[PDB]
């Protein structure tokens, strides 16, 4: 199945707009993903990683993005922070896998990269498996902002500052999470 392209995409979407792809009616050979020698983090909830290819599911979803290393720990169920609460929420009844590996070589330049953004202001925390991509001047206080920045009017998105000289805790990591679903429909993927 075309897991090769999802794991070899030249560019990855921003955290606040995680890139989602659907896979169904295929033949699953997950071992190929182990081609990448490095893996900073590799975990699975609900399924043993060694017996992934011996199961049958209705379909799967791959959600990929790029984050900072010290935030990679916020991609587990029942977590909290500035990522798990406003950019990507995992329901407790989670059955899937999460993979994260460093991307210092390809996603860092001396000048400084501002192509990756993450949300920083929001009124309420996101529901599990939900997305919100709507640029708008966040308003604080009773006064109306009228769509202009100022004392209590800010830009929700914040731009990561990437430089090759940053520490290990700031070099970007590519992250991909696979979610499996099985339902009344026939078990196609196997």
């Amino acid at each position, epitope marked *: 199945c075309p897991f090769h392209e999802v794991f070899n995409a030249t560019t990855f979407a921003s955290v606040y707009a995680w890139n989602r792809k659907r896979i169904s009616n295929c033949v699953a050979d997950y071992s190929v993903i182990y081609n990448f020698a490095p893996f900073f983090a590799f975990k699975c909830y609900g399924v043993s990683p060694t017996k992934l290819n011996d199961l049958c599911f209705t379909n799967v979803y791959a959600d990929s993005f790029v984050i900072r290393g010290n935030e990679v720990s916020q991609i587990a169920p029942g977590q909290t922070g500035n990522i798990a*609460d406003y950019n990507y929420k995992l329901p407790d009844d989670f059955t899937g896998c999460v993979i994260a590996w460093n991307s210092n070589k390809l996603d860092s330049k001396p000048s*400084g990269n501002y192509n990756y953004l993450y949300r920083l202001f929001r009124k309420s925390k996101l529901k599990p498996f939900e997305r919100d991509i709507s640029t708008e001047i966040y308003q604080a*206080g009773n006064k109306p902002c009228n769509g202009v920045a*100022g004392s*209590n009017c800010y830009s929700p998105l914040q731009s990561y500052g990437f430089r090759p000289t940053y520490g290990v805790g700031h070099q970007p990591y590519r992250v991909v999470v696979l979610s499996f679903e099985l339902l009344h429909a026939p078990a196609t993927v196997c």
Partner: antibody
Amino acid sequence: IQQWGAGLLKPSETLSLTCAVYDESFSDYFWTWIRQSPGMGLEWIGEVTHTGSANYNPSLMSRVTMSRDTSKNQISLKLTSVTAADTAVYYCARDSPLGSIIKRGDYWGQGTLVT
Amino acid sequence: VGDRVTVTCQASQGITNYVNWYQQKPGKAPKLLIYHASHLETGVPSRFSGSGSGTDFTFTISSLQPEDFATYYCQQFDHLPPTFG
């Protein structure tokens, strides 16, 4: 937090102060400058948000000028016209942005006095 | 002095829910004790607290420890510019 600048001045000139931090998360916090006249309350000068901007107090709008420096992680404050009515002590303050609320001024520098 | 003390802060024009309470000592930089009404900073042992909206904000202390001698200050967030007291 560290600070420095000009200590003794003469009326009708310009003042420049610099506030420097010693961490690496100097990209996601609001940074404000506080002025305190000798033994008389406090005053609010201006602030710089996360995305390299600035908001100035209306009374001192034109005179004041704030700026950042991400390469060395510093903040610069400039006053165009100094006099004998601006003698005070200046503090460098930080605000951490939370979700829908801002914990204004949760950390203050030692500051410095000017005449 | 000794057991209890209570202070009040008021606003003339406009109402708000945002206020802060700071502490000062002889020649040291001010510290923030309370932010956003009753919400407390994680540095407040001796029950420094105060809760109230509607232009009648209050600051209350349960007991006076040996290191409680300051010039506590109010503050505002909204209605730019912020003004102290």
